[PDB]
Design an enzyme around this catalytic site. Structure first.
Site, PDB file in Angstrom:
ATOM      1  N   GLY B  26       0.952  -1.406  -0.001  1.00 37.70           N
ATOM      2  CA  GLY B  26       0.210   0.492  -0.017  1.00 37.70           C
ATOM      3  C   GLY B  26       0.458   0.665   0.239  1.00 37.70           C
ATOM      4  O   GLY B  26       1.810   0.959  -0.177  1.00 37.70           O
ATOM      5  N   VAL B  28       1.720   4.276   2.492  1.00 39.01           N
ATOM      6  CA  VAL B  28       1.927   4.921   4.278  1.00 39.01           C
ATOM      7  C   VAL B  28       1.940   6.834   3.747  1.00 39.01           C
ATOM      8  O   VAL B  28       3.198   6.508   3.400  1.00 39.01           O
ATOM      9  CB  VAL B  28       2.587   4.180   4.443  1.00 39.01           C
ATOM     10  CG1 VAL B  28       2.637   4.765   6.010  1.00 39.01           C
ATOM     11  CG2 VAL B  28       2.517   2.357   5.013  1.00 39.01           C
ATOM     12  N   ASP B 142       4.827 -13.357   5.914  1.00 30.57           N
ATOM     13  CA  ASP B 142       6.019 -12.537   4.862  1.00 30.57           C
ATOM     14  C   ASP B 142       6.315 -11.130   5.978  1.00 30.57           C
ATOM     15  O   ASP B 142       6.556  -9.949   6.214  1.00 30.57           O
ATOM     16  CB  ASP B 142       4.892 -11.172   4.595  1.00 30.57           C
ATOM     17  CG  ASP B 142       5.351 -10.586   3.423  1.00 30.57           C
ATOM     18  OD1 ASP B 142       6.932 -10.606   3.299  1.00 30.57           O
ATOM     19  OD2 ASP B 142       4.867  -9.404   2.395  1.00 30.57           O
TER      20      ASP B 142
HETATM   21  C1  LIG Z   1      -0.119   0.248   8.661  1.00 28.02           C
HETATM   22  O1  LIG Z   1      -0.042   1.807   7.945  1.00 28.02           O
HETATM   23  C2  LIG Z   1       1.208   1.348   8.309  1.00 28.02           C
HETATM   24  C3  LIG Z   1       1.605  -0.205   8.016  1.00 28.02           C
HETATM   25  C4  LIG Z   1       3.293  -0.072   7.869  1.00 28.02           C
HETATM   26  N1  LIG Z   1       3.899  -1.169   7.120  1.00 28.02           N
HETATM   27  S1  LIG Z   1       3.633  -1.602   5.970  1.00 28.02           S
HETATM   28  C5  LIG Z   1       5.638  -2.430   4.532  1.00 28.02           C
HETATM   29  O2  LIG Z   1       3.055  -0.538   5.000  1.00 28.02           O
HETATM   30  O3  LIG Z   1       3.334  -2.704   5.659  1.00 28.02           O
HETATM   31  C6  LIG Z   1       4.229   0.577   8.577  1.00 28.02           C
HETATM   32  C7  LIG Z   1       3.581   2.090   8.157  1.00 28.02           C
HETATM   33  C8  LIG Z   1       4.352   3.473   8.900  1.00 28.02           C
HETATM   34  C9  LIG Z   1       5.272   3.997   8.025  1.00 28.02           C
HETATM   35  C10 LIG Z   1       6.132   5.014   8.796  1.00 28.02           C
HETATM   36  C11 LIG Z   1       6.943   5.581   7.651  1.00 28.02           C
HETATM   37  C12 LIG Z   1       7.806   6.811   8.618  1.00 28.02           C
HETATM   38  C13 LIG Z   1       9.063   7.240   7.417  1.00 28.02           C
HETATM   39  C14 LIG Z   1       9.531   6.632   6.776  1.00 28.02           C
HETATM   40  N2  LIG Z   1      10.866   6.869   5.949  1.00 28.02           N
HETATM   41  C15 LIG Z   1      12.025   7.573   6.136  1.00 28.02           C
HETATM   42  C16 LIG Z   1      12.951   8.428   5.655  1.00 28.02           C
HETATM   43  N3  LIG Z   1      13.209   7.903   3.984  1.00 28.02           N
HETATM   44  C17 LIG Z   1      11.451   6.922   3.654  1.00 28.02           C
HETATM   45  C18 LIG Z   1      10.982   6.828   4.741  1.00 28.02           C
HETATM   46  C19 LIG Z   1       9.090   5.106   6.522  1.00 28.02           C
HETATM   47  C20 LIG Z   1       7.865   5.029   7.202  1.00 28.02           C
HETATM   48  C21 LIG Z   1       5.871   4.896   9.769  1.00 28.02           C
HETATM   49  N4  LIG Z   1       4.997   5.057  10.965  1.00 28.02           N
HETATM   50  C22 LIG Z   1       4.541   3.807   9.979  1.00 28.02           C
HETATM   51  N5  LIG Z   1       3.012   3.527  11.281  1.00 28.02           N
HETATM   52  C23 LIG Z   1       1.828   2.537   8.633  1.00 28.02           C
END
Ligand SMILES: COc1cc(NS(C)(=O)=O)cc(-c2cc(-c3ccc(N4CCNCC4)cc3)cnc2N)c1
Ligand SMILES: COc1cc(NS(C)(=O)=O)cc(-c2cc(-c3ccc(N4CCNCC4)cc3)cnc2N)c1
Lengths: 286, 291
Positions: B26, B28, B142
């Site tokens: 998805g 985010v 996964d």
């Molecule tokens: C349920 O919704 C989700 C699912 C999933 N897991 S998933 C693979 O999609 O299934 C993760 C998150 C999430 C991501 C982040 C987040 C914050 C910053 C960054 N970035 C840092 C800088 N460089 C690029 C990436 C990446 C992710 C922070 N909180 C979160 N809850 C939310």
């Protein structure tokens, strides 16, 4: 549409039950879950009405889950035991942190203000539920602190679902609005956190507290209770004094408090919280 | 007997929607809840094409799964966004991204103290074990370093439930799932993740084609274990290597339960003092700034 059942935890899976504290509503003990391999806290007390009380608190905690509410892991509902199982909080309650001055000679202001902010956030979440849930029994003993000293609100035994807009935290007893109950307690908790003093220190009978507050009197605000070196002391005092206003309509919503607090907390860098927790745990040793 | 309905969050109360990542499962984005005054993460599908009822069912399934699997090391779901013009799952915001970034962005995280690595490993084991103890047992199937989020103090939160939507990440799939005959899956992934955390290297680094990686794994090959990938000065190196090699056994019946791994990990984590964890996390957060 999406409904979740609260897990039923078999008592026989709770090992190493050890008394942590005895309170008015029950006994809280630490334990280890045999299957999950995590430590838990168990609050246990039976008249069928009190059994209903326990089940009601369990269901409320289950529906009121949020980042700053004590996470309930399950309920133990067996013939020989009735207890609410929650996450184990190694750092006890805000009460211990504020008043055991030998353990915690210093508590850096950033940590205190983050605690205040998180209490405000959790209670605001409760008040924003549908229907809004009024806690009505907030106190520095109800606010537990997790491994990194983040707030977890507990003790939902005295709660209601109808907001519109021990007793040291109770507002005075006209047309009565119990929506503005929690804010009074929050004002007292704020005064406590900033002063590290017992509200109504010189009072030997709690009824003296009731009489004084009913007369419009509150904990003392002077240099001794609140040193002038408090960050944003003037704004915090205004927050407090409006929080415990004799008239409930003069007390702000928790949203107003969050609006009023955000810049205050913004003055501190995020790392200072961690630094204060490390200072705390270092000076608590030795 | 005790039932809780997952909150329905109005889309209009998600403010400052900012793209965080676009993935296989998805999209985010970070946002701020106007009423709760906190930052949240929203996982939503593409905004242009109308969602097919299969995608809507997938989203509802993931939301309900997160809701039923609530636990200390699972990503906390705060509500579901179900509106005419938006459908997204709302969870707590994890400021520190995923375990992958922590392990491999060596400029941000030049050093990751051993206590912190072992706490991460222990917490992952705890989360997946809890998942396996549910009724019915929930098999994640996964697990990967991208699914492992780290909250503000670098405590594990497992994420990414539901299915996948395509319309590098095979290093964690066991060789008997390459062709899924729909017949002890996660533990292999955990072994690979452990090897990665202790090595801070890309598994099968020298292999540029994942098809070659799959061929090797089907042949019983695994990431290389030597002094170069895992230096001998690693705490509890022998115990961890035994755990790894048993986890990714060619035969699934040879791979241990997560309960066995927790039993074996408990003393290891017990060797560390509580203050060492806080010190490791603060050291990490400090070197991440001014870099
Ligand atoms: C349920 O919704 C989700 C699912 C999933 N897991 S998933 C693979 O999609 O299934 C993760 C998150 C999430 C991501 C982040 C987040 C914050 C910053 C960054 N970035 C840092 C800088 N460089 C690029 C990436 C990446 C992710 C922070 N909180 C979160 N809850 C939310
Ligand atoms: C629902 O069951 C509860 C209720 C409530 N709140 S309440 C007053 O009852 O409304 C709290 C807890 C709880 C307490 C603790 C805890 C940790 C340390 C201590 N200390 C005792 C003396 N000082 C040193 C250690 C006491 C309690 C750790 N986790 C917890 N979930 C569990």
């Amino acid at each position: 549409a999406i409904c979740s059942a609260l897990p039923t935890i078999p008592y026989h899976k709770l090992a190493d039950l050890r008394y942590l504290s005895r309170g008015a509503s029950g006994t809280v003990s630490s334990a280890r879950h045999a299957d999950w391999r995590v430590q838990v806290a168990v609050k246990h007390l039976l008249l069928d009405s009190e059994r209903k009380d326990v089940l009601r608190e369990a269901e409320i905690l289950h529906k009121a889950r949020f980042s700053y509410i004590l996470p309930i892991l399950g309920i133990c509902n067996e013939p020989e035991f009735l207890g609410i199982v929650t996450e184990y909080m190694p750092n006890g309650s805000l009460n211990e942190l504020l008043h055991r001055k030998t353990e915690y000679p210093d508590v850096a202001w950033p940590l205190r203000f983050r605690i205040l902010h998180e209490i405000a956030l959790g209670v605001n979440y409760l008040h924003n539920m549908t229907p809004p849930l009024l806690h009505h029994d907030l106190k520095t003993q109800n606010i537990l602190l997790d491994n990194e000293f983040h707030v977890k609100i507990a003790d939902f035994g005295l709660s209601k679902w109808r907001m519109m807009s021990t007793i040291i935290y109770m507002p005075p007893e006209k047309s009565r609005a119990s929506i503005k109950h929690d804010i009074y307690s929050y004002a007292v908790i704020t005064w406590e956190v900033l002063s590290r003093k017992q509200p109504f220190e010189d009072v030997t009978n709690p009824l003296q507290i009731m009489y004084s507050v009913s007369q419009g009197h509150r904990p003392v605000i002077n240099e001794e209770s609140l040193p002038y070196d408090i960050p944003h002391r003037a704004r915090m005092i205004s927050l407090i004094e409006s929080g415990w206003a004799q008239n409930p309509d003069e007390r702000p919503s928790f949203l107003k408090c969050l609006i009023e607090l955000e810049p205050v907390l913004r003055t501190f860098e995020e790392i200072t919280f961690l630094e204060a927790v490390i200072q705390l745990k270092k000076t608590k040793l030795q």
